[PDB]
Amino acid sequence: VAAERLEPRVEEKDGYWILKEQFRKGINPQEKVKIEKEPMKLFMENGIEELAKIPIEEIDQSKLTKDDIDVRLKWLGLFHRRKNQYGRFMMRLKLPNGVTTSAQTRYLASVIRKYGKEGCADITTRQNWQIRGVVLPDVPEILKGLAEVGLTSLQSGMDNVRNPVGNPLAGIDPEEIVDTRPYTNLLSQFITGNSRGNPAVSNLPRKWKPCVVGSHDLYEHPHINDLAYMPATKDGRFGFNLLVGGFFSAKRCDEAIPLDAWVPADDVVPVCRAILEAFRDLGFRGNRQKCRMMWLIDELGVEGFRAEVEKRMPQQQLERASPEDLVQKQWERRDYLGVHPQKQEGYSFIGLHIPVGRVQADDMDELARLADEYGSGEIRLTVEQNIIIPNIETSKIEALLKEPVLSTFSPDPPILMKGLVACTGNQFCGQAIIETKARSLKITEEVQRQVSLTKPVRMHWTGCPNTCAQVQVADIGFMGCLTRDKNGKTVEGADVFLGGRIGSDSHLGEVYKKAVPCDDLVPLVVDLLVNNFGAVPR
Template identity: 50%
Template sequence: MTEAVTTVTASLNKFEKFKAEKDGLAVKAEIEKFASIGWEAMDETDRDHRLKWVGVFFRPVTPGKFMMRMRMPNGIVTAAQMRVLAEVVQRYGDDGSADITTRQNIQLRGIRIEDLPEIFHKFHTVGLTSVQSGMDNVRNITGDPVAGLDADELFDTRELVQQIQDMLTNKGQGNPEFTNLPRKFNIAITGGRDNSVHAEINDLAFVPAFHEYGEVGRLGDGEKDFTPTPYNSSSKVFGFNILVGGFFSAKRCEAAIPLDAWVSPADVVAVCRAVLEVFRDHGLRANRQKSRLMWLIDEWGLEKFRSEVEQRLGKPLLPAAPKDEIDWEKRDHIGVYKQKQPELNYVGLHIPVGRLTAEDMFEIARLADVYGNGEIRLTVEQNVIIPNIPDSRLVLFLAEPLLEKFSIDPQPLRRSLVSCTGAQFCNFALIETKNRALNIIKALEEDLELTRPVRIHWTGCPNSCGQPQVADIGLMGTKARKNGKAVEGVDIYMGGKVGKEAHLGTCVQKGIPCEDLQPVLRDLLIQHFGAKPRQEALVTH
């Protein structure tokens, strides 16, 4: 760790001061002690902040009941792992549940501090980790949800994503090299044509691009391991164009910008390390509202930032390929699809707002074992994919009762609904989101007919975990006024686009009371998305 990172000065904010006093990973050795003394007797900084370095989050709205955030690189989990997660949730009855996040991850709710030693032991037995999943660490690394399954993919992201995770976390044990970043950091890598990872909202993203072989020259020892043979030719070499600086915060939201750099798959992990080292050692730390990577790029300029990355990398980066290969509209993977493996299929299940009970999780694990090969995939739309289902088993699979709850053909509004945790469990949220989102969508579907999905995203606060800026209609929790009183409300965003030519939406209306929201959404859907009132609704209006 450099002197620049560890020096404590009077100008440091409180977060930098407590990080300098004690590394967050130090609490790994104190879990048994915390379990024995209980949450109320813990040092407040350990409880409220440092526990996040091992994926445990104190929630003031549910005191004594913690949240746990996992690390699931590329959104891949096994049936055995899912059962362990279900066992953990099941232990807490009505207080226990799990949420699929917008980073292909799972969060567990209702956790008690006294159970942490046993929970961590269970995780270890099946290869799960929650290390470095909160605070100033790299968050879950996202990749294509159908990597290795999709016949049209240009690159299978799974191995690279796992290598990045192993580098960052010391194979799940914790890595002090990267536990003191100036702020959180998001990485995504996509090998498909539809930008399934929302590259534009990540601090560092890799998108597929072919370079002229003459430009690339010798790729290095890793070429044989990573260059996808079907797309190799004498004139073109596969790799990635690099995007940097995308983020959402209460103060500012920015789409990632091109670094004007191309990298072979063999160098992706090294580039991640180099970028993170530059951010760690030079990122802005005085004001946490100005500590994400884009603020450093603004201060230095893109040319200096790239030069610093090259110095850490130990070689120059090639200029970006003239164009990337993101040329498809975004897919949601809900439904039944043929895999590139003969006679195998993957099936995408719609999980309403990503909420799972222990019973749901056990049943998903059973289906993955009985019909597939025990593998489960998660998507950034908070849904589940079960791959490797043989043609001969598909009819039986589709008749399973769970598919009545988790449909493969949901109605258009429900299909694309995304929601953050909301005020039910999160102390940052200004409004309740998940249940309200489902109730309003149900009412709108009864009232309107739509011919295509409309992506409606809910987020409880300006931290934007629900990503309203990428939605067709984004709803951000706020406090509104009605009849002179403060009430729960939303600011409305529109115009977000995903897939090819992705860009962020903008705020079009502010302070709409939630109790008045349904007719506002109804009008927006009719005016902008071709919705029509159902005939029976016309009679009653």
Template identity: 50%
Template sequence: MTDTTTTTTSLNKFEKFKAQKDGLAIRDEIEKFAALGWEAMDETDRDHRLKWVGVFFRPVTPGKFMMRLRMPNGILTSSQMSVLAQVVQRYGDDGCADITTRQNIQLRGIRIEDLPDIFNRFHAVGLTTIQSGMDNIRNITGDPVAGLDADELYDTRELIQQIQDMLTNKGEGNPEFSNLPRKFNIAIAGGRDNSVHAEINDLAFVPAFKEANGQEFSKPPIFGFNILVGGFFSAKRCEAAIPLNAWVAPEDVVAVCRAVLEVFRDHGPRANRQKSRLMWLIDEWGLEKFRAEVDTRLGKSLLPAAAKDEIDWEKRDHIGVYKQKQPGLNYAGLNIPVGRLYAEDMFEIARLAEVFGSGEIRFTVEQNIVIPNISDSRLATFFTEPLLERFSINPGLLARSLVSCTGAQFCNFALIETKNRALEMIKALEEDLIFTNPVRIHWTGCPNSCGQPQVADIGLMGTKTRKNGKTLEGVDIYMGGKVGKDAHLGTCVTKGVPCEDLQPLLQDLLIKNFGAKLKQEALVISG
């Protein structure tokens, strides 16, 4: 399947164990592992192959695994959320869930002996974890208000489900795409505000109108997508996606995804794990050769890109209550601080979606939740729900834009604790400062950039630093990330700031760069 002349002896350890046994083979061994217990498992199966079914061994919490779902377009039902809550609930204080920056959810505290029962529960409500880790296609992101937004250009939901079904064999596992050189991210934007952060995906589709037959004004322009390729974050390198100079009609998007992935699977570099993302292949080949190979796999030539795309709005965060295109209905965006949920929260969110909406729940890439289809007549009662005191529809201007990775509490890669520290610091800053606009602050625990500091107004990347002869938790500070139209990545402006010294520095940045004012000074002026 893979076009490579690398000998088996020269393969890195990941390619070696993938060559020995496909990760999907682990599906048939779950019962055995449950009976054996995690300590008796083969180390490669435990640490790596389990990720093909979405189960992640965590050295910082041995015996308590993380489980990652697949949520195409970030959509689930209240019954699915209730099942997730039941799973988390059985683990007491060890159990919780995190909404991710790919509109997905991860469960924590999972015990290996419970996997057969958990998978049975998932299957009963149409949930899958298949191919959600390691060298697979990650959760496919789309507009969080797809089908609700009166201004949308395309409803991304069905198309994203079709792509997932193709890549995962409708959630059963697809060996055609279970051995990529590295992980792969896909996003489809259907609105004008780039709500999916297209620029940080290996493959992204952004809305664009193309003149019919190349004859301007002869026919109405045709809707489709311009294609971007190669965006990614890693410890080695971070790059924004670049235009492929290609346009595709919606009905061909699934086929284009297949073609691009086949090229990456068969030709992508595999020798060095730090140089195995799609952009490294594009660097090696050049864009023209890469596109020509995609055309060959597709069986036809892609049309040249439309002259411009339709991403011309500033990015929306969907926090608050908004009218839907369906008369008399609204969607409510709830701010979930750093995306962290506990069982009782999940049960309550499922109840709200059932009682006030249509039983549907959506995730955003900012780690928040959208409950759609709330009728005008039910809004007043909805506003009185106690859960909205914690998961506000009108949070502070820092809290509403806060994003954080897992951090050292659960992740062995993280160099610092992130989520709790982020919450404490934002609370302190909002107590001291007055803001006129939201400021997007992203925390990530290590250079792998799961918290995406490069897209933030202020990005904080965990590191170790020295102060007074001691090693402390610290951050490198990024600034200048832009989302929405004209999106681009920020850059590192300061290195090695001890976390204990960070709050006054952030306060100064917010005052000088983002128009914040000290509350005390504002009171003096107004008084």
């Protein structure tokens, strides 16, 4: 690799980071949008105030403003559902470690309630909240309301650092390695500039995902993150070994690889900054399918990339990985649904199943009420789109289990529901090839009516090759496609994936059978469960 390849391609100009003139040739259309107007100005210079006043029909009449609502607003966590819910915006938060409060939950519920049939909310595969139904004129007030309850939506989509994932049992599990909350909190504060915006990390070549591991279970899925912090002692000191480059895409899925780097615990933010600066400064900005950080690592080689991280560390020091980490390979992933004792004597947490992560305003208020009456006003989200309510005095559990809402959001649903994960799909997402959430519930219910089983089989449904619901991690994965019935009629279908493993012995699943009509999936899945997962016909 030539020395010229290592010239930083972006520069700071008036508080923002822009592509240098000499590197602007051959860039993709999204890069052109960022050059034409800095997206962060919508927040940091309050550009949103005037934009929100313009009728959407008028906005659509000029490239600049249409790009504002369709592209730049994703820097403020706002996603125009142009195709499937025109004029409405999904809104996505920062929620490090999946931690929310009852007050925040009630606020979000009050927003979606206003929108009636156009509103609802979802737990995401990054243990995050999304709300739906937002209209542009309401955005300035919603931004204010979020701030008032201690939430930000900054930098949650597009070419930004995505939600920092941690251990859903952080601080409460007798078996945790290290509480991940301080680290994911620090990362979120760094990324968002303490909720003011951080332009230094908002002009990346592409999205970038971090997680901090604190569980032997590896609930955080470090193998599929762009940066994963693996807890490790080195020379008598606590810190993290670093894995880099994990990602999924339509074109390519790759597991994270060792950077061959260890940092002391206090260097979590400095090394996040160094890695992001290297990616920002040096990443390819052509074909969008070749812009994720792993592509830079392949171009430079991992050692070449490591040197770029090292030069961006304070005092330019980056230690080599510790030979061993603290994650025990002898481990069985633990079910977190149901009632479990905390490490604080006399307290329990309860894991509640949220069917395909979907909630309405009334449901959110109920969950917030439970967290206040039984817990400490805290609700935790999980990457399987479920919830945990921690800090419940164990003597209250008997009463809690009789709460009517637990018949819908159950601490002990059937085993296949426990592991079911589904993306948004075509109800709202314009990329979706099929409907996911309703279909996956229907099929799973029918399958479980036919077979019983004891193995915790994890089924993931995703609506298109973007694989937001991570079909490559599933025991059985379903990727949306269009296919044909026996008469040659167009029908919704799924490509069925097998072979995904999580935890320390992780593995990426691959397509097993293409183009199965959705109406034909039940018998296929029933047979797979009996033949490969020990299920027994009822």
